[model samples]
Every structure is written in structure tokens, then in C-alpha cells.
Target: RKEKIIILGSGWGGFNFLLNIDFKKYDVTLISPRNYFTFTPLLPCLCSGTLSVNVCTESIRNFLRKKNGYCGNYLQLECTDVFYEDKYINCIDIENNKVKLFYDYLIIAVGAKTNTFNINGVDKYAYFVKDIDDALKIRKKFLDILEKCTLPNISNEEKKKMLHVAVVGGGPTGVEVTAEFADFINKEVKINYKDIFNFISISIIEGGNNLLPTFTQNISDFTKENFHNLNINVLTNYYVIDVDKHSFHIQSSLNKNEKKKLSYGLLIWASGLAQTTLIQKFLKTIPVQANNAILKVDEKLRVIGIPSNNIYAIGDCKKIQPKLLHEHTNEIIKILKLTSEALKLKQSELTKTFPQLSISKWDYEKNKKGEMTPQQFHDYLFEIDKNYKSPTPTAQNAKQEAYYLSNVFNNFIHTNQKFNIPSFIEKWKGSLAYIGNHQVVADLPYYELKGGRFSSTFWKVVYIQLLLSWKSRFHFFIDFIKTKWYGRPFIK
Candidate 1:
């Protein structure tokens, strides 16, 4: 019997797995809300002025094509749901408002949703950067704030309130958005409305001790310095307990615990992410991890004790032992073999030169059931030199992992045999950020891959690239030319 391969969410993990998986054997079906892959890393720039909303986005259909023609012809439904007990998902028929689909093998990759923390006025007033629509809405509202304040009858205090931007959550996303806005207001907005730009107060509120706390101390310190240079106010250990239409209530970090009210025109909710409704629903059936609310997977990337071998999960959706180490060791072995054969070097000679390569570390600590420990996870990651690599829990890493997993899926479906997947240990040769207004922070080589740390130009180039669509790249160039000659595009 030909078993079906079902996947949810075309985000980083699922998308990557699909791309690299051998699709010849299994009937692969992908279910997602959005049709295209959103470059979420650049979403901050979309809200600011570094990039346009459409720049970093790409249609998933574009990359799905392989030599076989329509490698993903198996299935690609836009809106679908995972039904665990039935072992199949029901696709939503928008026309009739009905459910559809039942799969033989299910892969729950339903990405995640924004966490509003159920604040007083967050859902009503704040702007979120989850998807493109969120970015567009925030961008539109930001422009409206400026234009509305510059109107004929607005008072100075009202104008000040209108220009003030408050970003909740001191995480990477919040920090990036705040920094991007500060740079935009100071550099671009000031060119046209210098007075209004000067009055623009950007404040970042973090409930934690520091921004980018997941990163190493050095990287966190560097990011803090970067934010400081960008004139972004970092409010660490400050809890945004509540928010309202006109004012936001925040409690301080000190013992006094004084509450302060901040009035800002644009309030960006850049808080951390939470599991999606689909993911949360699925978790009810499985035993969840204590630390992160992710599903605990076994060595084969299968859900622990699920009693089904057909079902597999990866990426942000599931927490697995850092098997990437084992995968990396295998790749290095292949590379070493190739070098010895091609370069005519002796195996012993090669081993001397590359001791680390020859001696692969599998000293990972495991649980009673042989599952990986958090320390093992860290050791495996560090052994692979994760510090030199891009940070985890990022869209880039997610996509890379997804692409590789796709390859693995394809092989299993088509050949019914296992094939080794490669590691993403190679350094990247440039990174871009979406800042807004088609401007970006671009790093020339190997810098864009760095997760938490970024160069100034890295941020700008990424921002522009994030916003630069194939269509708008030229538009941005033209705008740049026009600006160099005249003054600015008539932004209304």
C-alpha cells in the first residue's frame, strides 16, 4: 500500500524538508495558511522604513519544481487542519465552509502564532509582525501616524504622542524593530520632516534582564551596544503589565516597583512566539517537554511513543536531540574520504591535519530512555561549533533544517532506504535585513548568517533585501536615482 506523507505549515522546517526530501515514493501533501514563504527575520524592517512589505517574500510554488516536473504535485492545500486520531488532516473548503482530507502519514508542522499575553489593549491597539498582513498594517499605521500628526489642527503634545513608538518585548524581534525605527526616523524621516523626526521617541520594553538573552554574553553585549549607538532605549526587567488606547502601564525592575504610563502613537507587540492552535491541539495527545512547549521526538525524529512510524515532525514544532551532530559527522567523513581519494593524500596524513575531523564526538548525555539531555543538546551543538554558526530558533536555521528534512522525507518515500543528509556548517557569504523604504543592512560575506550579532551594514542590507522584491528592486533603484537628483519620492 502506498502510504501518504502529510505535512503542515510551509514555514522554515516543513518547507525545507519538502524541498530536499525524495518525493518519488510518497504522496506528499503540505498544508499551510499562506501560499508563500514569508521571510520573518526581515519583518522588523517591513514595519520600519528599511524595506517594502513584499521584498523578502517568495511563492513556495516557485521552488517546488524539480527535474521530474512538479516535484510537489502530490498536494499543496492552502488551509488545512491536523486530526491526530484520524491520522489525517481536514482541509478547509472556503467555498462551502467545510472540512476535507484524511492522510495516511501525518507531519505536524503547523508553525506558530503571536502571543498577545492578553494585555488590556494589545489585541485592540498594538501592531504585530507575524505575517505580511501584519507588516503591511503596521507600515500603513506608521505612515498614518506621521501624516495625521502633520495635519493642520494637531497640537505639539499630540504630535509628540503620535511620533512616539513603543515596542513591547525586549527580545530580538523587539530590539531589531526598535533599532530599525530609530535609524529610520533619524536618517530618512528627518530628511523630510526634521522636527517631527526629532520628536520621535522610540522605547523598547523588555520583561527580561536583557535583550537577545538566548545568545552568548559577547553577542548580547554587542547587540546592546549596537542598539545604544542607534539611540534605542532598552528597558530591561521592565514589565508591561497592561496597555490601553491612550497609555501603557509598565512596572519597573527595582524594589520600589513604581508604575509608569507611556503614551505612544504606534505600539508594536514584538513579544516572543507561542505554539499555534494546531500545535497546541496536537500537544494534548503527546507528552510535552518541561522547558519548551515543543513535542519530544525520538532518534528517528518520530514523536516519542506515538505508536506510529509513518508520522514524523521536525523544526520548531518538535524538540529532538541535536542529531545534526551525527549528521555532520557523517558528512565530514564523506568529505575526508573524497579529499583522500581526489588529492591522493594518505588517510593517516589527512587525519594528522584534521584531527577534529577524524575524531567525531558522540559523547552526548542521554536520558533513561536514551533521549538527549539539554546539556547533551548543548554539547552536540557546541561540538559542531554552534558559536561560529548562526543562532538557533531563527527563521534562517529553521529554513535550512526544513530543506534538509525535505530531502530525508523524499528518500524514505521514493527509495524506502535511508540516505545521509548534509550539515549547514558552511559559513554564509552575506546577509540582509529589511529596514524600510527599500534601504537595507547588508553584510558582504559570511556575516548575514550570524544570528544574534549583526554589523550595521548587515542590518541595513538585510532590511532592503527583505523589502526588495524582484519587481521592487528596480523600483528602489529608480527611487534612489530620483532621490539623488531631486529630493524624495512623493510619499503620501
Candidate 2:
């Protein structure tokens, strides 16, 4: 009999391993609450109505079906419990509520969840864009605010506060959200409510020196400049001490270190992340990283202390501390090489075995070409030299280093042949927020580099692209033609 393999979560780490595994060898069962996979990195766009909810989600069943039939020994089971013991895990069947599954191999890809600092009124007041439902809520809220504020009875002060969008944190999500909102209001909202454009404010607070603190100094400085141009304000060296349904108290970085109360219509908390309950349970049985609550996994992606040879983990849930994300591509390549060798077949033979499959390659020159043009390339090098001499934005200096981070992401989604899996992938270039609502910078990774003012035109461009499905790009094009001619179906 084939060995039983059970996996958890269907995010980046779990889903990638599923595609790489030789399904012909063992019986694999994927367990998770979600029936579909969500492209999480682009969540901010979804929240801002720049991308539809469905565009970032794909059905797991369809994803698997497109691959091999039933994966020879694969089963999609909904699990509720994982009782890890001597060498295996006992899993409970959620649907039946009684059946138990003993797995020969277990993979804990149970990803993380949103981390709220347990502050009062947050759960009730703040808007979070972690899931599709959250995105929809945000969209409705955006439209609601616009329609409600336009009412003749609404006070000017209330309108100003209602249009006030506060994003807490300076991390990637917060920065992206601030830029997105700034873009939406400037581009789409301005034409409809030109009189209130000045009243609209988008503020981002970071308890650090600048936004995108994780990036290099060049990136950090460039982001600041981008924010300056976009007119999105940044309050650095300050922390939000308390928040209520209508207002938030913040401690400033000034010499007086004064506390100020600010009112907001919508408060977005994008500060940090945390492991889910299932992941925390698994961590109890394994060593965990101190900095984050991720599980410690070996180089082979197996849980550190688990003795089971069949068990493996990946993605944000595991402590596979790779310095650069490209390392993951290399790791996947190594697995493919091993798989090809194990099959004892030539490239053509392997391709024949796995029909409709495309292998990913790591061609650095091709990658660089996609990320930067010859002019931008030379300009960046010159800018680095100029920074050494005297740091300032110059014509010779490239303001943004166009990173094709989405290239790998796009590759992953398009290659996912799982019949039930969702076929959409979301992309984000980069952006920054400054002060008030006058200046904001955005970089469309798929389009331009030197991030610029967030505008309505850019918002629509990004939104349209986000809604396109990567599973079948040509299919999306056809669908777009139909929609343009006849409009979308009322119920599909």
C-alpha cells in the first residue's frame, strides 16, 4: 500500500510543495478550511477596489484537477485537528466530525493569521484587508463613505473626518494601502467630488525613521522622495498609543513628545502578522524561531524535531530563513532536478510524462531586462556613485529600482496545474505616502519604475490588470471582449 501523506494550508509554501511533489509515488491529502487559494501579497489592492476579490482567489479543487487525475493517491480532506505523536499525526475529519486519519507523512503549512495588538475598539472599528471578505467590506465602506458624505445634511467637519483614512504602520502593506487610497481619491474621487478633494486626507504612521524600513537605504530614500511627490504624509518616530471607534491617540517624535488625538473615517491596521492556532499547535511540538512564531524547518523543508520522513513544511509558517526570495526558486529548481533524475528520463521524456507542464528557469540576464531598461540600468549605477559623492535626486539617478518580484509569483500561479486551484495572481510594483493628500508615489512593477504621483488613471490600470487571471491569460482577454460588448453577467 502507498504511504499516506497529509498536508496543511494552501498558501505559498504548502501549495508550492504540492506542485513539486511526485504525486505518482504517495497518497497525498490536503487539509485546510479554505476551498481556494488566495494570493495574499496583493491584498491591499483588493481592498482599494483596484482588484476584484475573485481575481486574487482560485479554487483548490480545480487547481488539482488540471494536474494529474486525483494525483494517483491525492485526497482533499478538511481537517480540524492534528494530534502529533511518536512518529505520525492523528487528524480529525471536520465534515464527518468523527473519522480520524493517521498519516505516514505530515506537512504543516498552516499559515499565519492577522496579529491585532489586543487594543480596545480595534476589532469593532479598524478595517483589516487580510481576506477576500475583508476586501469586499472595504469596498462597500469606500462607496458608503462617498455616498453618505455627499448627503446635504453631512457637516463639513464630518466630511473631512469621514474622508480621513488612517493607515497604521509603515510596512509594505501600510505603505501600499496609503498609496492606493491616495491614488483612488486623486484619480476617481476628485472628478466626482472636486470640491472636497482638499478635505480628503490619507495619513500613514510608522514607529521608525521612514516607510519601507526593511528596504535598502537607496530604496528607503527613494520611497521618501516618492511620498514627497505623491503628497501622502508620513509621521515617523511616532506610535499610536490608543484608538477608539472614532479617534486615535498618537505620541509624536518631537522634543515635547506630545500626545495628539486624531479623528479618522476609516482606520487600517497593517502593522504585523502572527501564526494561526493550527500553526501554533504544530509549533508546540517543534522548535520555533524567537523573532517570529514560525516553525523551525530543516533545509529539506521538514519540521526540525519531527522524526517522520514524509513530513515537510514551507512558506511563512516555517523558519526556512532564506536571505533572498530567489533562493526559493533555486530550491524549487533543485527539487525539479532531483525529480527528473529520479524518473530516469530525458527532458522530453519528463515533459511527456507530465503533459501540459512548463518548467521555470533562472535566467538572470532575462530577469534584469524585464526589471530595468538600459537607460535605467546605467542611471542607477551612476546614481549609486552620486550618492557616495552627495546624496540627492538627480536626472542621472534612477528613483526606483524596478523589481520584478511578481515575475516569480506570476510564474508560480501560471504553472499551478491543480484542477481546483484558482488561476489568478496579483502583482504590486511599489509605492510611498507623504503628507496630507497632495503627493504620493507609485511604481507599477509591470509597467514603470520611477514611482510617481498616485492618480486615478494609474488606479484603474492596476485594477484592470489585477482582475485578469493568469491561469488562462488568453481566456481573460476573451472574457474582457465579451464584457466590453455586452457587460458582465448578472449571476454566473
Candidate 3:
């Protein structure tokens, strides 16, 4: 008898796994609230009318049917809870009808939701750019704001407030949305509403010292310069404390005691993400959890405190304990210590072989010249350990985990024997971003490209290739050409 494999959330992790898994080996079922898989990288394009909703989304059912004959089994329902002891999951349909699903293997890849940090009035006032409906709402609200500003009865101050747009957070999503909004204003709004265009203002508020903190400093700097040239204001080290219908309160990192209120017609919250309620409730049942949000898993992606192969987690919802880097560094330090004692090699030789272990060049030189003691060497390693961090939760990381788990499942199904799944070690390929004005920034392993039409073309091609299906790719290509020729639609 074939094992029943039930996967949750048709996002990057679950969808990619389904695409690669051998359907013949198991009876597969996917559960998600949305019937379509959204290509999130281009979601910002939707807000600017650069791409339509259909261009960037593909039906999960159609994708599975193309891979398997019968479109596979899928339930458009929300997962309520997981009963690990009974080997079942409780899910509810749109109408609140509940059902229990049993599975031999359970893969949790439910993804995450936007984090508002419980700021007052955020839930009611701020808009998110997470899904299709969000993009639509933003587009509609943007035009509404413009129309409202053009009204004859509106005062100059009211018009200014209505024209001011604030984006909280400086991550990729915030940056992309700001860029797209700028492009729309420059390309279309300026042409049609030149008189009111001067009154329009765009601002990005980042809690960190710089935007795109996860990226290289040079790339972040380049993005800031681009925003400056576009007349987009970037306020660094600023945090949103609270928000109301027409304004928000902020505090600066440079002056914690000082607070300011800023008025805006719209606010886009892209600060960060947190676990969904389902994952949070499920985590309470598990013995070990990370940061009170992510489920703790072993190196093999198996949920800790559960039968090894029966329950696995992936994507943003899961956190693997003792990250691979930590494990590797620990093992390397042990080997180095043993080798140094056995061979009686000087600290200089070890430092030369492992420059990453050194706190500084001066320290390496001192250790190299036999000026440092064995205790100092151990202290150096300890200092390095303080900076170690786990892999960041991203679509790229989720896809890699999905690919790894797919192979592990295939091997186990064919052999009918359990084998150890290797720890996932990520090898980053590259990172790319669109910064408006027909320019792009990319950080590749071998080379870095920044700001030009060439980089923009490369970015477009890369994203086009990332589309889930040929249909999506074709539609996106057509949309790209149309956008370049006629510009984006300004429809509400």
C-alpha cells in the first residue's frame, strides 16, 4: 500500500515539492486556502498595473493536473490544527465545515503573514502587499487618493496629506513597492496630472540604519542613491510606534526620547513576517519551538519531538535547530584542535588555513607568530560563535528545502527503508532587485551588476524564467511589452 502524503499550503515549499515528487509512489493531497499559486516576486508589479492578476498567478489544480493525470487531490480549506498522536489534521472549509485528514507523512509549509508588531490602528489603517487582493486594493486606493486630491473643495493641506504615501520597512517588498509606485507616478501621473504631481510625496521608513539590510552595503547604498535621484525620501533608523486613519507616530533610533507624527494618505506595512495562527496553535502542542513562532525541526526537516519520518516541516514556518553552519563550525574547530595538538603546528598555520575563524588581521598575525596561547585560540572560536546565525527564511531557501525533501521521499518510497536525510546546506546563486527608472541591481556569486538598462533587462529575464508555467511566462512577456509601449493603466 502506498503511503498517504498530505502537504499544507500551496506556497513555494509545498508547491515545489509537489512538482518534483513521484506521484506514483504515494497518494498525495495538498491543502491551501488559495486555489492558485502566486508568484510573489512580481506582486508589486500588480500594484503599478505593470502586470495583471492573471499574468502572475497560476492555478494549483491546473499545475498538478499537468503533472499528474487527475489534477491530484486538493482541498480548498484552512488548517485548524494537527493531532499528531492520532496522525490526523483538522481542517475547515470556507463554509466552516470541518473534516479530519489522516496521513502517513505530513509536510507543513503553511508560510507566514505580515507582522504589524501590534501597533495601534495598524490592522484597520495600513495596507499590505502580500496577495492578489492586496495588490488590487492598493491600486484602487491609490487612484482614489489621486482623485480625492484633485477635488475642488479639498484644501491645500488636505491635498498634501492625501498625496503623501508612507511605506514602513525597507526590505525587498517595501523597496519594490516604493519603486513601482514611483515609476507609476513618473510615467503616468506626471503626464496626466502635472499640476498635482509636484505635491505628491513618497517616503520609506526603515527601522534599520539602511534599507535592504540583508543585502550587501554597496547594494543598499546604491538603492538609496537611486531613491534620492527619484525624489523618494528614505528615513533610516525610524520606527512606527502607532498609526491612525490619517497619520502615524514614529520614533528615531538616533533619539529614542523624541517622537514625531507624520500625515499620509496611505500606509504600506512591509516590516516583517510572523507565523500564522494555525502554526502558533500547533506549536503549543510541540515540546520545542523557536522564537515562539516557528516550529523546531531537526536537520533532516523532521519536526522535533515527533516520529522522525512521519512529521516534517519546511518553508518559513519551520526552524531547524543548530543550523548547519553552527554544526560545521563546531566540527571544524574540534578537528583543528586535534590536528594542532597531534602535529604541534603553530597558531599562525591554522590562522592562514582558516581566515574566517580570525576576529581580525591583527589577531591572526599575533596567533601566527606564536604570541597567543591555546586558551586565546579557544576564545577566538567562541567569539566567532557569537555571530553565527541560521539561514534566512526566503523563497530561495524554501525551494531548496523542497527539492532536497522530494529526493529523500522518492528514495525512501522505492527502497521501503529509512535512510538519513542530509542536512540542507544552502549555496546562494544570486540576488536581484528592480529600483525603477529602467535600472536594476544584482549581486551574483562571480560578478555584481548595478544600475542600468542592461541590468534591468537581465532582471526581467530572470523573473520571466521564474514563472511557474509556460502560460504564465507568455502572459508576463506580453504584459512586459505592453507596459513598455503604452505604460500602466490608471484604472481604479
Candidate 4:
């Protein structure tokens, strides 16, 4: 009988894995709250009216139909809890009814939620751009503010407050959304509301020392400078402490006592992410888990302390921990001491003295913590530069991991033997950011490119190719051309 494999979440990792895995080897079931996969890279474009909501999203069921028709099913529900001992997952449907699903193998990729950091009034007041609904809400709220600002008897003070827009977080989402708003104000909003256009203010508050800290320093500096030229206020070292309906409080990280309250018509929050409730509850049962915000998994992507290899985790919800090497640490230390003593000896003499040590290429590397190293002890100490590699929570990284795991599962099914999953190695492809004024910053491994028209064109082309399906790509291109021809519609 084929094993039952249940995958949780329909984000980049789970969806990509489902598309690539061989359905003949197992009975596969995918569970997620939404039945569609959202192309998050183009979410900012959606907010700016450069693309429609459907252009970057595709139905998960339709996508599966294009693949081979095999043992596959999808459950449009949320995973509420996991009974690891019984190998059952408890889920709740849209109607709030519960169901239990049993599986021989489980893949958890439920992803994450926005981190509010326990700030006051954030959940009640700030708008998030994490989903399609968020984009629509922001668009409507923006137009409503503009309409209010154009009132006949409105005072200048009220107009100023009504046109002010505050964006929290200096990460990619915050930066991109700010740029999108700036573009809309300069190109579209100004033309429509000439009287209140000069009073419009956009401020980006970041808790970090600079924006885009994950990118190179040059890229961060370039982004800040470009926003400055566009008259967008980039507030670095500014931490948001509280938020209200019309105003938010911020304190300067550099100067502890320096705090101020700024009023705004709309506040967008894009700070960061935290583990979801499902993941948090699941972690409480895993005694051997790492002390991080995410679940801990072994090199094989299997959940540690699970007693069996039936459960694996991937994507943003999990952290990869180094295989425990406590048993081999003494041996490694002894080898290091011997190597230090034989530093002055010739290579051949060192090997002759340490007859137990083999100098073969295989001796330098081994599986997880079980492998021994003689001359490679120092390298092992810093194994791959860290004890464990925690994958960055990004769509690109999730896709890479999904592709890698598909192969891992395929081999395991075909061989009918235990195969150790290899360590994940990340390759730098490149990154692009759309700044205002049709400018973009592209960072590649070898060189960096920054410009207006040409780089922006490059950015659009790259994202167009990244759409999940051919139909989505076609719709995206159509929307692209329509935006150019008709201009972005200002409809609420």
C-alpha cells in the first residue's frame, strides 16, 4: 500500500513540493487556509495598481490538475493542532468544524505571521500588506483619505493630517510599499488632487540602523539616497512604540530619550514575522527543539526528538540545527591537539606518527556529527560557518528548499532504504528593488546595477518570468500593458 503523505500550508515550499513530487509513490494531501498560491514578489505592484489581484495568484486545485493525475487531494482548511504520537493532524474547516487526518509521513510548512512585538494599538489601527485583502484595503483607504482632503471647507491642518502616510519597518516590504505610494502620489494623486498634493507626506520608520540590512551596505545607502531625492522621509534608528487611530509614537534608538508622536491618515506595518500559534503549540511537545522562534529540524529536515523519520519540516516555520556532535567532541579535540603537536613535522612523518588517522579525501568530510575529522577539525568546528544554517524567510529560499526536498523524497521512495538528506547550500542569484522614479537597484554576485529606465525594465521582466503558471503570466503581461495604456485607475 502507498504511504499517506500530508503536507501542511500552501505557501511557496508546500505548493512547490506538491507540484514536483511523484504522486505515484504516496497518497498526497495538501492542507491550507487559502486554496490559492500568492506570488508575493508582485504584492507591491498590486498595491500600486500596476497589476490586478488575479494576475499574481493561481488556484492550487487548478495548478495540480495540470500535473499528472495521481494520488492527490487538497483540503481547504487550517491545521489547528498536531498529535505527533498518534500521527494525526487536527484541522478546522471554514465552518469551524474539526477533522482528524492520519498520515504516514508529514511535511509542515505552515509559514509565519506578522510580528507586532506587543505594541499598543498596532492590531487595531495599522494596515498590513501581506495578502491580497490587505492590498485592496490599503487602496480603498488611500482614496478615501484623498477624497476627505479635497473637502471644500477643510482647514490646511486637517488636510495635512489627512494626506500624511506613515509606513513602519525598513525591510523590503516597507521600502517597496513606500516607493509605490510615492510613485502614486507624484504621478497619479498629484494630478487628481492638485490643491492637497503639496501637503502629502510619506514617512518610513525603521528600527534598524539602515534600510535593507540584508543587502549590501552600498545598496542600503543607495536606497536611502534615492528616497531622499524623491522627498520620502527615511527614518533610520526609529522604533515604533505605540499606535493610535490617527497617530503613532516613535523613539530614536540612537537617543533613548528622544521620542515623538506623528499623525497620519494611514499607517502600514511591515516590520517582520513571528511563528504562528500552530507552530508554537507544536513546539511545546518537542523536547529536543532549539530555543528559537521556529521549530528545529535535523540535516535530513526531519523533526528532532520525533522518534521516527515520518515528520519533516521546511520553509519559514522551521530552523535547521546541526546534527548533535557531543559524542565525537572529545575525539575531535584530541585530533586537534595531535595536529598542533605535529605542525613542525613533515606531512609524511605526521601521517606515520598518527597511524590511526586516515588521510583520504573521505576522512575530511562525513555525515552530520558521526563523521570524524583529523586535519579538518578546525573546519568542522565552524562547520559551514555556523553550527546550523537557518534558512532566511523568503519566497526564493522556500522554493529552493522545496525543489531540494522533492528529490530527497523521490529517492527515499524508489530505493526503499534510509538515505540521509544532504545539507542545503544556498546560491546567490541576484536581487532587485524598485525605487521611485522608475529606478531600480540590482545586486548580483559579481556586480551591482542601479539605474532608472533600464533597471526598472529588467525588474519587470524578471518578475514576469517568476509567475507560477503560464495563465498567470499572460494575465500579468496584459495588466502590465493595460497600466501603461490606460494608466492606473483611481477607483476605490
**Total backbone collisions for each predicted model:** 46, 29, 1, 0
lDDT of 3 by residue, 1-492 (tens): 578889998888999988877777778899999888888888989989999888878788776654445345788989999988889999999999998889999999999999989989889999998899998999899999888878798888888888998999899899999999999999899998877888899999998988888777888999999999999999989999999988999999998898989999989999888889998898888765534657877666788877545888988888666333233444455555233242134334433233233233124333333333555545545544454344478888888899888888888646755544455555577888888787788888887777875887898788878777899888888998899899889877
106 Cα displacement, candidate 1 (Å)? 2.3
lDDT scores of the candidates, listed in order: 0.60, 0.55, 0.80, 0.79
Q: Give per-residue CA lDDT, model 2, range 45-121, as digits (tens).
A: 55555544455666666555435555623345554555556544444454565556677777666666666777777
Model 4 lDDT per residue over 336-355, tens place: 33342232223233333222
Q: After superposition, how far is residue 184 of candidate 2 from its true place, in Å?
A: 1.0
Please give each candidate's TM-score: 0.72, 0.65, 0.88, 0.88
Per-residue error (Å), model 3, residue 137: 0.9
- Candidate 3 CA-lDDT value: 0.80
Report residue 482 deviation for candidate 3 (angstroms).
Answer: 0.7
Quick one: ranking by lDDT, best first? 3, 4, 1, 2
Quote the lDDT for 218 in model 4: 85
Q: Give the Å error, residue 279, model 3.
A: 1.1
TM-score of 3: 0.88
Winning model by lDDT = 3
Residue-level error in angstroms, candidate 1, position 316 = 2.2
Q: Which candidate, 1 or 3, would have the higher lDDT against the true structure?
A: 3
Comparing candidate 3 with candidate 4, which one achieves the higher lDDT?
Answer: 3
